[PDB]
Curated annotation (Swiss-Prot):
This is Polyribonucleotide nucleotidyltransferase. Residues 1-59 form the KH domain. Component of the RNA degradosome, which is a multiprotein complex involved in RNA processing and mRNA degradation. Belongs to the polyribonucleotide nucleotidyltransferase family. It is found in: Cytoplasm. Coiled coil: none annotated. The lineage of its organism: Bacteria, Pseudomonadati, Pseudomonadota, Gammaproteobacteria, Enterobacterales. Involved in mRNA degradation. Catalyzes the phosphorolysis of single-stranded polyribonucleotides processively in the 3'- to 5'-direction. Residues 69-137 form the S1 motif domain. The chain holds residues 554 to 695 of 711 of the full protein.
Amino acid sequence: RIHTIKINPDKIKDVIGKGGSVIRALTEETGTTIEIEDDGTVKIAATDGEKAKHAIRRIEEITAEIEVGRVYTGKVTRIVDFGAFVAIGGGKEGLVHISQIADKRVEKVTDYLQMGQEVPVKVLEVDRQGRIRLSIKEATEQ
């Protein structure tokens, strides 16, 4: 049968890879046949539900990968002397530094951020252990 996942049209580029590079690997991993159709729809053809089911998870996981230069919507959990902690999907708390809040100079981040508040964030660095440095100031887009 045919199963599908529907995702935003910019995220089709994460799924194609470089000119079908990912597609080959996602075909090899899952064992499914992947057809793509407009408005960001990916149709996944298999003969057992369990394989398309896994392929549907594996696409969700491939666009849940944190990659550099990427802008996201995040939420302030903890504000320290040198930065604030901003959570993104799956419980990922990256560190926005004190110099990555605004164009103005910052003496304390606590003047600019409170807990519970939604902020837009761009990734800078991701460490091999799993630590993240984020930026609000290049994601603000005024």
